[PDB]
Write a protein that binds this ligand. Structure first.
Ligand SMILES: *[C@@H]1O[C@H](CO)[C@@H](O[C@@H]2O[C@H](CO)[C@@H](O)[C@H](O)[C@H]2NC(C)=O)[C@H](O)[C@H]1NC(C)=O
Ligand SMILES: *[C@@H]1O[C@H](CO)[C@@H](O[C@@H]2O[C@H](CO)[C@@H](O)[C@H](O)[C@H]2NC(C)=O)[C@H](O)[C@H]1NC(C)=O
Ligand SMILES: *[C@@H]1O[C@H](CO)[C@@H](O[C@@H]2O[C@H](CO)[C@@H](O)[C@H](O)[C@H]2NC(C)=O)[C@H](O)[C@H]1NC(C)=O
Ligand SMILES: *[C@@H]1O[C@H](CO)[C@@H](O)[C@H](O)[C@H]1NC(C)=O
Ligand SMILES: *[C@@H]1O[C@H](CO)[C@@H](O)[C@H](O)[C@H]1NC(C)=O
Lengths: 182, 48, 320, 195
């Protein structure tokens, strides 16, 4: 349980669990590579307990232009689909809790958990990049998430005695813009 | 709501199409516990 | 690697008093976040510019008959689930709790927009286009041509007549196959080949490790632990300790961000060079001296590498 | 074709609003940096107030000094940061300007054979246009179209001797063989002058 603790003045916050650390009999608490308290020994029962900070992460909001619509999609970065906040009962510091946060369209990606967008089996050009090959777009009156398509399929009719030669041509004009000064 | 948080982050009342990083979430603690040694003898400050 | 840093968590963490004192220090955290986000976006821009040179996905005919030229070692391998050429996964194996601690200190790593499979697909499309159509697919519609005729064209490109190739086709194909075979052995035997790719990873990891290590410095305070300061002093004397801790941590963050900006600029220059090399050596035949290998340029083949790209330059060298 | 293509450019620019985003980004970045510098003057940096005049009008010099040095340090740090970002941005702008100068010299003052350097396709010529804090190039390129299908051979055998094309390629529609240039279909009879 995500609770505070006080071990002889060792104040902190986190989740206490069982530890497999081979603590020596004279040892009190361990530490990590970052030189922070990782495990502790209970002063009363002499039991070694692991310390892990409560779950956390960044939050990103996916939205089209406000001139277009008002719906949004929320992506919880590097958070498993199960541990996403389901209840807002004084257990999260972000009051922007989703209208359901569950039962709704919920997609789990390699970039985190995406809530508020409907997965589809099609593939279009990338519109809003999400990460790990997943893009999002506003289609129709709704927000959808899909896998980006690299391009149209093609196959040249290769043979060892066949060639192709143009007969017409086109004159094309294109533009290029380069900053020169500030 | 998250859209208003985005507007607060951008310091504007209009938001262009895109993905924006607003803030971070964490699970708030439920209760607090205290673990202390089981000894009860009182220190001899009266003598000193 | 694209990294994101939680400014408040790194400096303060869970202490509201530290956040309140940080509030009066200006909008430094927003500046840091904006710079880091710019770098992260530039990374994907670099990758897209280097690899998304073509808009179509060409495919190799099932019958691999190219007049003696082999191409087995650089074409995708259907058997492997990753669908990578033997050289590609050979390269992918050369390049190799701390992550948990970095995450717990407020430092995270964002995933790239293009997965490795997508990049391998792009390289396979480029290979198929340059094999079945020469340089035509890079300037319009792809027109097929037999591979020996394309080799004769490229021989004319460097000043040698076609009859030389048509009369030494077997020897030329054997030499090409042997060189391609020896490339794999040269990569496998020497583990120091991917030094340029290893150095970037080493530098980034070491900078992140230094940032993590800086969290255990007093900077003149009584202790380097925030809770110990808070759980031992009343506010009006705790403030003068919190302030110096804050100043030290802010200095560390600023230094890290500046170094990252400079490193990103250098990486962007390298990526621009790589994109130019792709366009001029893979999509065509180059006359610039030593731009695509040493010798007289004939053709080039790209191969994907972790956070990079590898070019195989085929050149003509006189002898005897 | 040239006139139609040059006519379409104006409509393409007028329709698309985000055409000059590359030029707009520099202006936006500089304006944002200046705005941040201006806004940073309202921070206490641990002092009683962010105004120097009221501090000097309310406290004695011996402690006004210890009130003022904090503001001095904070403002100096802000200036240092701003100057560093400006230096980095100027370096990248210089790189872009060098690229633009090279493109001018090689696409406008001559014809380039580097692939994709001057437009997409086979380069013919370029025209420069001036924009605020930048330049615009109009690349004219040759693009093949309407390809066909033919059977080809490496060489033609006649009188026991092998013949090779001088500057073309051998093709046939199915019964009769010709020699034609590679980039345009123009069949011709195979004689001893083109082989
Ligand atoms: C090559 O392309 C040109 C233009 O793209 C073709 O000319 C067109 O021909 C049709 C049929 O008569 C006309 O209706 C169009 O008005 C023409 N366009 C122009 C711009 O003049 C031409 O037919 C193509 N094929 C060739 C020249 O063999
Ligand atoms: C040329 O292509 C042929 C197939 O078209 C390859 O033949 C086999 O390739 C596998 C791949 O490792 C080898 O394990 C087999 O031993 C090859 N067959 C024989 C009979 O040796 C051939 O390897 C390719 N050339 C090269 C140099 O790899
Ligand atoms: C392939 O090219 C040959 C070139 O001669 C074509 O033969 C000519 O066809 C026209 C139209 O029928 C006749 O008027 C000429 O007299 C033919 N030339 C000769 C030398 O006989 C032929 O039609 C083309 N197309 C095919 C063979 O399908
Ligand atoms: C976390 O997500 C994975 C899917 O990526 C799932 O298999 C696993 O069960 C989840 N964890 C828990 C505790 O449910
Ligand atoms: C040329 O012939 C091949 C073989 O059928 C065909 O696949 C291809 O589409 C043809 N190309 C054109 C331009 O007609």
């Amino acid at each position: 349980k995500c609770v505070n603790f006080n071990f002889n003045g060792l104040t902190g916050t986190g989740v206490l669990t069982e530890s497999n650390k081979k603590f020596l009999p004279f040892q009190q608490f361990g530490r990590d590579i970052a030189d922070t308290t990782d495990a502790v020994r209970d002063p009363q029962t002499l039991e070694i307990l692991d310390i892990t900070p409560c779950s956390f992460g960044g939050v990103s909001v996916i939205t089209p232009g406000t001139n277009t619509s008002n719906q949004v999609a929320v992506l919880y970065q590097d958070v498993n689909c199960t541990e996403v906040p389901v209840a807002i009962h004084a257990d999260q510091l972000t009051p922007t809790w989703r209208v359901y946060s569950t039962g709704s369209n919920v997609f789990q990606t390699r970039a985190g958990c995406l809530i508020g967008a409907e997965h589809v089996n099609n593939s279009y050009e990338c519109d809003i990049p999400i990460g790990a090959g997943i893009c999002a777009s506003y289609q129709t009156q709704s927000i959808i998430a899909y896998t980006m398509s690299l391009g149209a399929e093609n196959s040249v009719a290769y043979s060892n005695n066949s060639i192709a030669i143009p007969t017409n041509f086109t004159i094309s004009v294109t533009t290029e813009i380069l900053p020169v000064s500030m | 709501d998250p859209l208003s948080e985005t507007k607060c982050t951008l310091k504007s009342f209009t938001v262009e199409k895109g993905i924006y990083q607003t803030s971070n979430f964490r699970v708030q603690p439920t209760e607090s516990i205290v673990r202390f040694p089981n000894i009860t003898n009182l220190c001899p400050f009266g003598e000193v | 690697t694209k990294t994101s840093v939680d400014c408040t968590m790194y400096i303060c963490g869970d202490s509201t008093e530290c956040s309140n004192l940080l509030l009066q220090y200006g909008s430094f955290c927003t500046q840091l976040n904006r710079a880091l986000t710019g770098i992260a976006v530039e990374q994907d821009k670099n990758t897209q510019e280097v690899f998304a040179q073509v808009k179509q996905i060409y495919k190799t005919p099932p019958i691999k008959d190219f007049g003696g030229f082999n191409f087995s070692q650089i074409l995708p391998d259907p058997s492997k689930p990753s669908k990578r050429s033997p050289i590609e996964d050979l390269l992918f194996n050369k390049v190799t709790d701390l992550i948990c601690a970095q995450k717990f200190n407020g430092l995270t790593v964002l995933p790239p927009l293009l997965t490795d499979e997508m990049i391998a697909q792009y390289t396979s499309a480029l290979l198929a286009g340059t094999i079945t159509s020469g340089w035509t697919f890079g300037a319009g519609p792809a027109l097929q041509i037999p591979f020996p005729m394309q080799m004769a064209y490229r021989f004319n490109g460097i000043g040698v007549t076609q009859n030389v190739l048509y009369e030494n086709q077997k020897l030329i194909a054997n030499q090409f196959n042997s060189a391609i075979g020896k490339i794999q052995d040269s990569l496998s035997s020497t583990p120091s080949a991917l030094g340029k790719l290893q150095d970037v990873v080493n530098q980034n990891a070491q900078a992140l490790n230094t940032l993590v290590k800086q969290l255990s410095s007093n900077f003149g305070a009584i202790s380097s632990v925030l809770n110990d300061i808070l759980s031992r002093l009343d506010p009006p004397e705790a403030e003068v300790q919190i302030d110096r801790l804050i100043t030290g941590r802010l200095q560390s963050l600023q230094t890290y961000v500046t170094q990252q900006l400079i490193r990103a600029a250098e990486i962007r220059a390298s990526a621009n060079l790589a994109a130019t090399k792709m366009s001029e050596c893979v999509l065509g035949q180059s006359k610039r001296v030593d731009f695509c290998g040493k010798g007289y340029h004939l053709m080039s083949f790209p191969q994907s590498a972790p956070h990079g790209v590898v070019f195989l330059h085929v050149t003509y060298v006189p002898a005897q | 074709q040239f006139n139609s293509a040059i006519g379409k450019i104006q409509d393409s620019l007028s329709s698309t609003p985000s055409a000059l985003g590359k030029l707009q980004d520099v202006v936006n970045q500089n304006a944002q940096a200046l705005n941040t510098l201006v806004k940073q003057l309202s921070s206490n940096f641990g002092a009683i107030s962010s105004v120097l005049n009221d501090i000097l009008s309310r406290l004695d010099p011996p402690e006004a000094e210890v009130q003022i040095d904090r503001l001095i340090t904070g403002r100096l740090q802000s200036l240092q940061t701003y100057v560093t970002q400006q230096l980095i941005r100027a370096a990248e702008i210089r790189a872009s300007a060098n690229l633009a100068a090279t493109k001018m010299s090689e696409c406008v003052l001559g014809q380039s054979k580097r692939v994709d350097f001057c437009g997409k396709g086979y380069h013919l010529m370029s025209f420069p246009q001036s924009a605020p804090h930048g330049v615009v190039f109009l690349h004219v390129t040759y693009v093949p179209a309407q390809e066909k299908n033919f059977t080809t051979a490496p060489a033609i055998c006649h009188d026991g001797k092998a013949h090779f094309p001088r500057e073309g390629v051998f093709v046939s529609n199915g019964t009769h063989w010709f020699v034609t240039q590679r980039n345009f279909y123009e069949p011709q009879i195979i004689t001893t002058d083109n082989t």
